[PDB]
């Protein structure tokens, strides 16, 4: 409602390295304006995508935040929430509300369940990257440019074979030591 609050959308979401031609005060009268349309602000992937494209091109709808909306949930399709969506793709750069760690193994456990295992972490990984651009993803140092080369770097950290499955509970201790962990783990 606040136009100058929108400010701190463009301003965060500028770090998450996404600009928006479209000024604050214009994404507050769409932002409010998407939401009174619908019901509340529940979109669907066809209209999520569209908003997508249409804020951040240079960014491939499918890399990152494509990675984070179909996270929240999007079982069989139906519609999520747009706002608590919208926080969820701030709320992994910004640093404003105390609370932040363990309310990442939201969208790390794309499933859901409490445990966090290969496969989901995989695809986060791949979203980051797949979001940056090829042409420029080479740039980066080699034995480290890969989805599946890093995989090992942060699954590598913890180290786990039997109990494969990490909770919502260590993923906060295993993260409380380790502080070399803070480094990569930077989900950007």
Known sequence: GNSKSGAL????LEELQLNTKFTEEEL???????????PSGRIT???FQTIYSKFFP????????????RSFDANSDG????KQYVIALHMTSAGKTNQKLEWAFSL??????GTISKNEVLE????????????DTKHLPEDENTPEKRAEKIWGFFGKKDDDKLTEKEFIEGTLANKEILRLIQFE
């Open 108 to 113: 790390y456990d794309v499933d859901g369940n």
């Open 124 to 135: 986060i990984v791949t979203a980051i990257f797949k979001m940056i651009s090829p042409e």
């Open 28 to 38: 507050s009268s769409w932002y409010q304006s998407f939401l009174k349309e619908c």
């Open 45 to 47: 992937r066809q209209e």
């Open 58 to 69: 240079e960014a491939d709808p499918k890399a990152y935040a494509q990675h984070v909306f």
């Open 79 to 82: 519609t999520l929430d747009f």
């Open 9 to 12: 959308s463009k301003e965060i």
